Amino acid sequence: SRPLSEQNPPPVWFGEYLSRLRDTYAPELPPPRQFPDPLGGLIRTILSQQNTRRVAQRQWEVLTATYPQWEAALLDGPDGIEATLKSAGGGLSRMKADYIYGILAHLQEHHGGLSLRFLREFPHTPEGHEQARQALAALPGVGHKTVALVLLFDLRRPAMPVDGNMERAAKRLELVPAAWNSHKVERWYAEVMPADWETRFALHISGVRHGRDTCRSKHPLCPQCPLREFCPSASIFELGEA
Ligand code: SF4
Ligand SMILES: [Co+2]
């Protein structure tokens, strides 16, 4: 076997991909999440998945107003959490309630209480970051995309979350081959990207914005995309709408 970065080296213009995305879409980086406990960050990330930004934010507001401490959510059970989520709008309330409840119940029974503060105590070394990743991945229902998001957003650890928008753009740019699944795409990005948190955070913020707002699934805005000169797919889309 062979590292993904050797099977698939980044292009000569990779640095310009990073800098043009940052300059165009995130010239001033937003703050990462600094919640009292990473458990709150994890739950906030769960609310964001398969959801609009507006609904996820309303749900966070309503959920935390309803349950000022997570102990109250655990007592109210998945039915209570579901009702709370449903009241703020948005679907998948039953799925999300079960998922959140399962995390809380696991933490209470086996981790001494409703907290993920222990994630902050692992060393800030590649070995410690891997422990933090493994601990998030050991929570019931928590998949790799959410693990990467919590590491990057809540823990200041240099994971490399790649959302579906970013992946679509990466495949159109031919940064990664079409057949690679989302987890393999994340692994490739984590191998090739500069190791530092800030660069990785900047790519995630700017890449999500680019993929959502420019490299749209139907009708991408190639003429207005700063990556057009590097992109093998632009001509197909441009000539197509003509
Ligand atoms: S040129 Fe078009 S297809 Fe290529 S990255 Fe930009 S928006 Fe996406
Ligand atoms: Co048009």
Chain-centroid distance, C-alpha 57? 15
Residues 133 and 37 reside in one and the same domain: yes
* 116: DSSP letter: -
**225 labelled ligand-binding:** yes
Give 12: exposed, middle or buried? Use CB within 10 Å, 0-12, 13-18, 19+. exposed
Q: What is the distance in A from the centroid of ligand 2 to the CA of 21?
A: 22
Residues 133 and 190 reside in one and the same domain: no
- Residue minimizing CA distance to atom 2 of ligand 1: 222
74 sits in which H/E element: helix 70-87
Distances (CA, A) of 166 to 125, 162, 173, 228: 27, 6, 10, 15
User: Cα separation of 190 and 200, whole Å?
Assistant: 9
Residues 27 and 117 reside in one and the same domain: no
In sequence order, what are the residues at sequence separation of 6 or more whose Cβ sits closer than 8 angstroms to the Cβ of residue 182? 144, 145, 162, 164, 167
In sequence order, what are the residues at sequence separation of 6 or more whose Cβ sits closer than 8 angstroms to the Cβ of residue 138? none
Q: What is the distance in A from the centroid of ligand 1 to the CA of 237?
A: 8
Which-ligand-closest: CA of 223?
1
Total Cβ atoms within 10 A of residue 65: 10
User: Cα separation of 3 and 83, whole Å?
Assistant: 46
String of DSSP letters for 193-220:
S-SSHHHHHHHHHHHHHHHHHTS-SSS-
Q: Which of 224, 228, 230 to mutate to test the pocket of ligand 1 (most atoms within 8 A of CB)?
A: 228
Domain count, the chain: 2
Q: Which of 208, 209, 227 to mutate to test the pocket of ligand 1 (most atoms within 8 A of CB)?
A: 227
Closest CA to 33 of 45, 22, 25: 45
Residues with CB under 6 A from ligand 1: 169, 172-173, 214-215, 220-222, 225, 227-228, 231, 233-234, 237
Which-ligand-closest: CA of 219?
2
Closest CA to 195 of 224, 157, 166: 157
Chain-centroid distance, C-alpha 129? 16
User: Cα separation of 84 and 87, whole Å?
Assistant: 5
Residues 114 and 77 reside in one and the same domain: yes
User: Cα separation of 162 and 145, whole Å?
Assistant: 7
Q: Which atom of ligand 1 is nearest to the CA of 222?
A: 2
CATH code at position 98: 1.10.340.30
Residues 121 and 67 reside in one and the same domain: yes
CATH code at position 221: 1.10.1670.10
Q: Which range of residues forms the domain containing residue 11?
A: 1-31+158-242
**222 labelled ligand-binding:** yes
User: Cα separation of 180 and 59, whole Å?
Assistant: 33
Identity of the residue numbered 135:
A
Residues 152 and 135 reside in one and the same domain: yes
Q: Which of residues 97, 127, 157 is at a domain's end?
A: 157
Closest CA to 35 of 198, 153, 134: 153
* 165: DSSP letter: H
Give 233: exposed, middle or buried? Use CB within 10 Å, 0-12, 13-18, 19+. middle
Q: What is the distance in A from the centroid of ligand 1 to the CA of 23?
A: 16
* 216: DSSP letter: -
Q: What is the distance in A from the centroid of ligand 2 to the CA of 163?
A: 25
Residues 24 and 59 reside in one and the same domain: no
Residues 151 and 187 reside in one and the same domain: no
